[PDB]
Amino acid sequence: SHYDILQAPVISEKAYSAMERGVYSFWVSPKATKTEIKDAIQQAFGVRVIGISTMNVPGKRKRVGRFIGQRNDRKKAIVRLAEGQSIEALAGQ
């Protein structure tokens, strides 16, 4: 359902700085429509979104011993809200 769509938050110098300007960044399910993501974030956080952007991200191909393989392809979503609305569980961070 809703909660299924949001795999994880993005953790990195970039993303923190973004939330410090009130802009948050989530690892999403690769098939997700932007509207689906928008709605999902709203329900999960009771926050009105004014802007989204997304990006499909090919997973790094790495090797373990003789075994060459690919990590899961992902999708990154960046959202910016109105009203300087924040999200607590990820703001203190």
Partner RNA sequence: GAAACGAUGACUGAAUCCGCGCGGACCACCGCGCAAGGCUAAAUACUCCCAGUGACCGAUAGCGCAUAGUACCGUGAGGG
Partner RNA sequence: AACGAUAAAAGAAGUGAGAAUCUUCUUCGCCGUAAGGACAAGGGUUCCUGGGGAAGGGUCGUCCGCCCAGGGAAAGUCGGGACCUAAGGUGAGGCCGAACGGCGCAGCCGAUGGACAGCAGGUCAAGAUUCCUGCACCGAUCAUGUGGAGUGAUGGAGGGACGCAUUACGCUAUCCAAUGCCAAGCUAUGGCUAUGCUGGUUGGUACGCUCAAGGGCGAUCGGGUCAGAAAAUCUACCGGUCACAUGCCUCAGACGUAUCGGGAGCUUCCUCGGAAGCGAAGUUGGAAACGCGACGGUGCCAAGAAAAGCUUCUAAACGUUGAAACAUGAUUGCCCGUACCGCAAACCGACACAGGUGUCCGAGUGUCAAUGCACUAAGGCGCGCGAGAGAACCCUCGUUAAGGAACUUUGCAAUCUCACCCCGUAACUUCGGAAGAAGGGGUCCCCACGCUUCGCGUGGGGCGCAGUGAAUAGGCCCAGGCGACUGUUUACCAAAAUCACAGCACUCUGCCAACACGAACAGUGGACGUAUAGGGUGUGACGCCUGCCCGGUGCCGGAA
Positions in the binding site for RNA (CB under 7 A):
10-15, 18, 23, 25, 30, 32-35, 38, 51-58, 60-63, 75-76, 78, 80
Nearer to RNA, 34 or 91 (CB): 34
Q: Minimum Å distance from CB 51 to RNA? A: 5
CA distance 19 to 48: 15
Residues in the chain: 93
Nearer to RNA, 82 or 91 (CB): 82
Backbone CA torsion sign across 19, 22, 23, 29: positive
